[PDB]
Amino acid sequence: MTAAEHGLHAPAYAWSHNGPFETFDHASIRRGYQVYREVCAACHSLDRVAWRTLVGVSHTNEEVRNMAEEFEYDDEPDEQGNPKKRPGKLSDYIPGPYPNEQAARAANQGALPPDLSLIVKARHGGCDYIFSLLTGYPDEPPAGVALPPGSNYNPYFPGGSIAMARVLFDDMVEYEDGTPATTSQMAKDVTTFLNWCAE
Amino acid sequence: WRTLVGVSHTNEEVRNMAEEFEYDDEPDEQGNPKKRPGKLSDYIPGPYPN
Amino acid sequence: DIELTQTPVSLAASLGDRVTISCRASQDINNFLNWYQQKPDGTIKLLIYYTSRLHAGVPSRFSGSGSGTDYSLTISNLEPEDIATYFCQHHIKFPWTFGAGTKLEIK
Amino acid sequence: SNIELAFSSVEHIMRDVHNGYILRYLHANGASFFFMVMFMHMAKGLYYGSYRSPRVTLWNVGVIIFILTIATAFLGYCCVYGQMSHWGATVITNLFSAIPFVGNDIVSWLWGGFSVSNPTIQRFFALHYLVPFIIAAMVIMHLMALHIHGSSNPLGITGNLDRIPMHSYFIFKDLVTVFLFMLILALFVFYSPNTLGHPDNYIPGNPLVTPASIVPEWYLLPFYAILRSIPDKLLGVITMFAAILVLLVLPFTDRSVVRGNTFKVLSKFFFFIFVFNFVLLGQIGACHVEVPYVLMGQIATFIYFAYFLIIVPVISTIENVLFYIGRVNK
Amino acid sequence: EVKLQESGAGLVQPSQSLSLTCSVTGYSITSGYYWNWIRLFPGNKLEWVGYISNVGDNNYNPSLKDRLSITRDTSKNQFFLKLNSVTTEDTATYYCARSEYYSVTGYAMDYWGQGTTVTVSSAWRHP
Amino acid sequence: KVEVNLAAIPLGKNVVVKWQGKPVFIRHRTPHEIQEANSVDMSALKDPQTDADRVKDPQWLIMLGICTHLGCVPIGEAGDFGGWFCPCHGSHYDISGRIRKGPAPLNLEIPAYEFDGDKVIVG
Amino acid sequence: VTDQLEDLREHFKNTEEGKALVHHYEECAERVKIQQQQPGYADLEHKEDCVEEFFHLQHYLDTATAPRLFDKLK
Ligand SMILES: CCCCCCCCCCCCCCCCCC(=O)OC[C@H](COP(=O)(O)OCCN)OC(=O)CCCCCCCCCCCCC
Ligand code: HEM
Ligand code: HEM
Ligand SMILES: C/C=C(C)/C=C/C=C/[C@H](OC)[C@@H](C)[C@@H](OC)[C@@H](C)CCc1oc2c(O)c(OC)cc(OC)c2c(=O)c1C
Ligand SMILES: OC[C@H]1O[C@@](CO)(O[C@H]2O[C@H](CO)[C@@H](O)[C@H](O)[C@H]2O)[C@@H](O)[C@@H]1O
Ligand code: FES
């Protein structure tokens, strides 16, 4: 197997949750949720994560209740059998951006953005791979590489040709706590949030 | 629908009966919902949605 | 025997432009028409088949289209050099027959 | 077990069930440990000549248990319904399509349809629940066979002159390894629970896409390599099953007059050649079908079979003679 | 790669027989498709002579059917052309060609031999 | 039965669609690919079959994406023969879907199908 | 405040090893740029690319920036 086909090996970053006695950094998880909401959520679902699980991990009960209510969910039909909607509650699962796979692909030139609830456990490399991918888009592909129309070059992705373009750029998000929102900081925070979503 | 075949009606008769009703089909390439006529594999539809 | 009539019957043209040859069969051939290229040195290659299908190695500038009894072979430009005779043949029924030909030259 | 609910129900166990992740990681890592210990149990038997008379029946029942355990583990893996589950289910059930004439019918029967689908997963779970009970009954049969002759020992000679009761001595000696086993299993379950698994199984099964990264469960790798070594469908399947069944020829190919390898130089050497050859077979299985792995796998496959059919009988015969001429003189 | 190599006497005397051979390599004559013979007259106009299918069946242009005999040799993977009682009318450059066949697109001669100029003359040539 | 819009499929592009639980491969073959498909000697094939006996329209390769060895789905535009590669035990298929190397005994199966305007119905 | 990973990567592209690696990639890039200008480049089937050279460079950078990056982040 050629290097390109395998994908560049993701290096080992010093995640603060690495190590037998280490917990996740919950401030990083909290910040990572914001990155997910403002950037990733437009194309990525988080179907296996229930609103209530964020409580006591990265947000207060009140904060999650307010976030859940910003969305609409199907309620039980009224006394006449007509369909009706209701605001979200703690028991609901975080809603995805698309109603179905067809819509998802139509919004991404035929490609389907995978659910990210388990992405950290579903990829060799875990946090290192996710982080390296998000921060590994060069401005241009290496010489001699013909990139299929609609594709983007990223050495860490097997084959080098990925349907997702670089989405993280400096200061695109305004961190509630004052942390400078650099590309690597956002990648670090969102990856930590995604590791918590998976585990 | 298929169970009526060879019991009370012919394949042709049941197919015509099934096609008089509309059932949910897979959404189109845009993700928009769409309908289709019933087939032998479908179950006889009820008068109420809920 | 079906007979095809090519036109213009061997007419020259300039390199800085396009050209459009045509074939007309004495009968309905139903798109079963191919185009061949006979280079000056004698070598003959297949250019187009089934009215519009391009053969391997032929430049995307070669079009070719039609139906019923009238067909064509449209080119985008003669650059670098496509100077040779173009023949058309139907294969709807046996025996197969070819056209008169159309020798393309420079002005 | 419904194909549309299976993967999510395991996630429900991981997320919603109190201590569910502990149950799941214990069950998954437990299966790997079951195989590592079983490999060691079988290897001990091989080394000490445990398969030799009067324990042939004990050995044969053990081979049956090995087959049932592999089958059980396969059925369980299918229940997760991840990407490896769907494709492992597809490939393994397809092994039967190699049976001439009726092969395709057997596969369609196992599937309960056109392909691995709802009928398949639901029956696999029902069967996964059943086989462990059949294994328990075979273990009882294994113990009955062991009981009439007792255990052998590292010297390979009679143990009738000096016995000690199981109680206290071996009850407490077994406890030492029980705690060591639990300690190591806990390290994996709590600190590195997915190391022995495949990331692709965290991706729901998709009937239209077989991932390029597909790899069998580690304990199946040596057998997978043996199958891959044969460039023919039928012979590959036959050879792979033969790799398990060849264990049954050992009581007959071991020509030695003494039981076990403790006092045998050449046998000890070749036993370790066999052990590392098995590990190599597993490593080859984890590699792509490329040069020079193909040839290496074919040679290691030959060595695997040669051990039972050629090396053991030839070496054991040489050693019998060596023991004779090395002392007797005339 | 597929190659059609033509050979044979490119000079025959009137009333005699024209024998041409087409040596095919890189593709078996019995595998499939049609193996043709076509001619290009001096006035620069093509005419389909006939063929021999991969099964061994013939199909001759009725304009020559009574004179030609297209045969083949499986062992050598080559087909032949035989035109009886030649006339100056038969003077032309002869070509052998493989004709593909797909149910939707029909026939198409994709591979062509280099061609052999045959002259029906009374002239003598050292054989 | 299942319908697919051929007009939406560009030149050198592969499309996979479900039919009776199995994936159906559809490729809009380029002129170069078509020549490659019909220019291989049968002697080099364990399951000898012409490209014409496998496709109705040389431009449209339609077949079941089920490896004939043990049922895996071969990966498109991969392998050493310009076609498909099965990652399960290493079978290689060419641009016509014929088996070229590996344990698989037969070429990828061609399902019954018919053309209708700018679409094809498989079944 | 610019990206911390970008800063670290720029720093290491300047070390002796970093410069040799960029040089090797740049040399491959130029060679490829020339091959493309040649007639009939679209028909070669053996077109060289610089993925391997780029990988050597990136691997070196990753080996140096990976253990240092997080100390710079929050
Ligand atoms: C179908 C399946 C076929 C069977 C598959 C075979 C399974 C592969 C083997 C599994 C691993 C277990 C290793 C083998 C176990 C050793 C067996 C044994 O009984 O060894 C006894 C031996 C020394 O004992 P003695 O009694 O002869 O000492 C004389 C004292 N006077 O003890 C020794 O000499 C020391 C033991 C050295 C351990 C070797 C470990 C290497 C294992 C590699 C595993 C790593 C995998 C990634
Ligand atoms: C920082 C927010 C985001 C994160 C964390 C993220 C993460 C990921 C990850 C980990 C993958 C999987 C790659 C693999 O298969 O190994 C992926 C794929 C993909 N993402 Fe995102 N993504 C984000 C935002 C976006 C956005 C905003 C879009 C839509 C504009 C998008 C579109 C896609 C697509 C189309 C794919 C499929 C790539 C392929 O398989 O070729 N992503 N993303
Ligand atoms: C669920 C699996 C199994 C269980 C619970 C089991 C249990 C036992 C127990 C309790 C003993 C006596 C103590 C010991 O020597 O370890 C024994 C002995 C033995 N077992 Fe097993 N066994 C299993 C599988 C196997 C397999 C797979 C084989 C062979 C293929 C096998 C072959 C033997 C033999 C030959 C002995 C005699 C060892 C000697 O005394 O020299 N067993 N087994
Ligand atoms: C209803 C119950 C049924 C049908 C039971 C069937 C049991 C069959 C056998 O057990 C006795 C069988 C599991 C055993 O063969 C001796 C194993 C060594 C088979 C090893 C095995 O695994 C693979 C695997 O795991 C995969 O994962 C994704 C993928 C695989 O290819 C890509 C394989 C594979 O190619 C082989 C040979
Ligand atoms: O589909 C994305 C589209 O963007 C382009 C613009 O030139 O690609 C450039 O930007 C991508 C975004 O990170 C890079 O991945 C890519 O390597 C770069 O050339 C198009 O080429 C591409 O189709
Ligand atoms: S299943 Fe494709 S090679 Fe075995």
Query: H or E element: which one contains D288?
Result: none
Non-local CB neighbours of A149 within 8 Å, separated by 6+ positions: none
3-state helix, strand, coil in chain E (%, to 5): 0, 55, 45
Distance CA E96, CA E5 (A): 9
Strand partners, E119: E11
Q: Which residue has the tokens 């925070």?
A: A189
* Mutate which: G28, G45, G46, G51, vs A, most A CBs within 10 A: G51
Touching subunits for chain A (3+ Cβ pairs under 8 A): B, D, G
Here the CATH number for the domain that contains residue G64 is 1.10.287.20
Is C46 an interface residue toward F (CB < 8 Å)? no
Distance CA G15, CA G61 (A): 10
Which tokens belong to A182? 């650099």
C-alpha pair distances (Å), A198 with each of A46, A123, D19, D96, D272: 10, 11, 16, 37, 42
Peptide bond into F10 cis (omega under 30): no
- C-alpha R_g of chain A: 19
The angle formed by the CA atoms of residues D92, D223 and D139, to the nearest 5 degrees, is: 85
Distance CA A111, CA F69 (A): 29
Identify all chain A residues contacting G73, using CB atoms and an 8 Å cutoff: 184-185, 188
CB burial string E1-23: b at 16+ within 10 A, e below: eeebebeeebebeeeeebebbbb
CB < 8 Å from C in window 8-27 of E: none
* Mutate which: E34, E93, E100, E105, vs C, most C CBs within 10 A: E105
Q: Between β-strands A152-153 and A161-162, what pairing exists: parallel, antiparallel or unpaired?
A: antiparallel
Q: Which among D32, D50, D200, D217 is annotated as catalytic?
A: D217
* Residue G6 CB coordination number (10 Å): 15
Domain spans of chain C? 1-107
Distance CA G25, CA A140 (A): 13
Non-local CB neighbours of E44 within 8 Å, separated by 6+ positions: C38, C85, C101, C103
Q: Return the CATH fold of C1-107.
A: Immunoglobulin-like (2.60.40)
**Ligand 5 centre distance from Cα of residue A108 (Å):** 14
CB pairs under 8 A between E and F: 40
Distance CA F109, CA F22 (A): 12
Please give the residue range of the domain that contains residue G36.
1-74
DSSP for residue A114? P
Non-local CB neighbours of B21 within 8 Å, separated by 6+ positions: B37, B38, B42, B45
D9: burial class by Cβ within 10 Å (0-12, 13-18, 19+)?
middle
Minimum distance, in Å, between the CA of residue A73 and any CA atom of chain B: 18
Considering every ligand atom shown, identify the ligand nearest to the alpha carbon of residue F90 and give its number: 6
Distance CA D276, CA D300 (A): 10
CB E11 within 8 A of CB E100: no
Q: Which among D8, D53, D151, D192 is annotated as catalytic?
A: D151
CB C64 within 8 A of CB C44: no
| C-alpha of F25 from chain center | 6
Which tokens belong to C107? 């002005």
- Type of residue at F12: G
| C-alpha of D1 from chain center | 26
- Type of residue at D208: L
CB A185 within 8 A of CB A179: yes
* Residue G74 CB coordination number (10 Å): 17
Distance CA A148, CA A87 (A): 42
DSSP letters spanning E16-31:
S-EEEEEEEESS-TTT
DSSP for residue A93? B
CB D283 within 8 A of CB D216: no
Q: Which domains occur in chain E, in start order?
A: 1-127 (2.60.40.10)
What residues of D form the annotated binding site for a ubiquinone?
147
Distance CA G27, CA G50 (A): 9
**Ligand 5 centre distance from Cα of residue A169 (Å):** 15
Q: What are phi and psi of A121, to 5 degrees?
A: -90, -20
Identify all chain F residues contacting C58, using CB atoms and an 8 Å cutoff: 31
Distance CA G11, CA G61 (A): 9
C-alpha pair distances (Å), A39 with each of A33, A49, A172, C49, G2: 10, 17, 9, 51, 20
| C-alpha of D113 from chain center | 30
Resolution of this model in Å is 1.9
Distance CA F59, CA F61 (A): 7
Query: H or E element: which one contains D228?
Result: helix D221-228
Residue A127 has, within 13 A of its CA and on its CB side, a CA count of: 25
* Residue A186 CB coordination number (10 Å): 29
Distance CA G74, CA G70 (A): 8
DSSP letters spanning F14-45:
EEEEEETTEEEEEEE--HHHHHHHH-S-GGG-
Query: H or E element: which one contains A87?
Result: strand A85-87
- Type of residue at D152: S
Give the residue, by CA position, lying nearest to ligand 5 atom 2: A150
Which tokens belong to A19? 């190590």
Helix/strand/coil for C85: strand
Residues of chain A with a following break (C to N over 2.5 Å): none
A81: burial class by Cβ within 10 Å (0-12, 13-18, 19+)?
exposed
The interaxial angle of helices D233-245 and D56-80, nearest 10 deg, is 130
Please give the residue range of the domain that contains residue A104.
4-199
Distance CA F90, CA D20 (A): 38
CB D226 within 8 A of CB D243: yes
Q: Which residue has the tokens 């629908």?
A: B1
E76: burial class by Cβ within 10 Å (0-12, 13-18, 19+)?
exposed
Q: Between β-strands E11-12 and E116-120, what pairing exists: parallel, antiparallel or unpaired?
A: parallel
> In CATH, what class is D1-330?
mainly alpha
CB–CB contact C56 F59 (8 Å): no
CB–CB contact F69 D233 (8 Å): yes
Query: H or E element: which one contains F84?
Result: strand F83-86
Number of domains present in the structure of chain G:
1
* Residue D245 CB coordination number (10 Å): 11
Residue A164 is assigned to a ligand binding site? yes
User: Closest by alpha carbon to D290, among F101, G49, A123?
Assistant: F101
Helix/strand/coil for C55: coil
C-alpha pair distances (Å), D72 with each of D104, D121, D196: 23, 14, 18
Which tokens belong to D137? 């009954």
Output the CA torsion A140→A144→A150→A156 (10° steps): -70
Query: H or E element: which one contains F24?
Result: strand F22-28
Here the CATH number for the domain that contains residue A184 is 1.10.760.10
Considering every ligand atom shown, identify the ligand nearest to the alpha carbon of residue A185 and give its number: 2
CB A11 within 8 A of CB A126: no
Which tokens belong to D113? 């349809």
Which tokens belong to E126? 């050292």
Helix/strand/coil for E72: strand
**Ligand 5 centre distance from Cα of residue A145 (Å):** 12
Annotation says D4 is catalytic: no
How many Å from the N-terminal Cα to the C-terminal Cα in chain C? 36
C-alpha pair distances (Å), D319 with each of C2, D255, D260, D265, D323: 90, 10, 12, 9, 6
Distance CA A194, CA G19 (A): 36
For the stretch E121-126, contacts whose Cβ atoms lie closer than 8 Å and that sit 24 or more positions apart, written own/partner, are E121/E11, E121/E12, E121/E13, E122/E13, E122/E14, E123/E11, E125/E9, E125/E11
Residue A44 is assigned to a ligand binding site? yes
CB burial string B16-28: b at 16+ within 10 A, e below: eebeeeeeeeebe
DSSP for residue D308? I
DSSP letters spanning D160-179:
TTS---IIIIIHHHHHHHHH
CB A104 within 8 A of CB A113: yes
Distance CA B13, CA A196 (A): 57
Helix/strand/coil for C18: coil
Q: Between β-strands F91-93 and F83-86, what pairing exists: parallel, antiparallel or unpaired?
A: antiparallel
Distance CA F86, CA F88 (A): 6
- Type of residue at D113: G
* Approach to solving: X-ray
User: Closest by alpha carbon to A9, among D195, G63, D214, G22?
Assistant: G63
DSSP letters spanning G3-61:
-HHHHHHHHHHTSHHHHHHHHHHHHHHHHHHHHHHSTTTTS-S-----HHHHHHHHHHH
Distance CA D269, CA D252 (A): 20
Distance CA D45, CA D39 (A): 10
The angle formed by the CA atoms of residues D126, D132 and D135, to the nearest 5 degrees, is: 135
For the stretch D140-144, contacts whose Cβ atoms lie closer than 8 Å and that sit 24 or more positions apart, written own/partner, are D141/D61, D142/D58, D142/D61, D142/D62, D142/D65
How many Å from the N-terminal Cα to the C-terminal Cα in chain E? 32
* Residue A138 CB coordination number (10 Å): 13
Distance CA F76, CA F33 (A): 14
* Mutate which: E34, E75, E99, E104, vs F, most F CBs within 10 A: E104
- Type of residue at A125: G
Q: Which domains occur in chain F, in start order?
A: 1-123 (2.102.10.10)
CB F60 within 8 A of CB F26: yes
Residues of chain C with a following break (C to N over 2.5 Å): none
Strand partners, F25: F16, F63
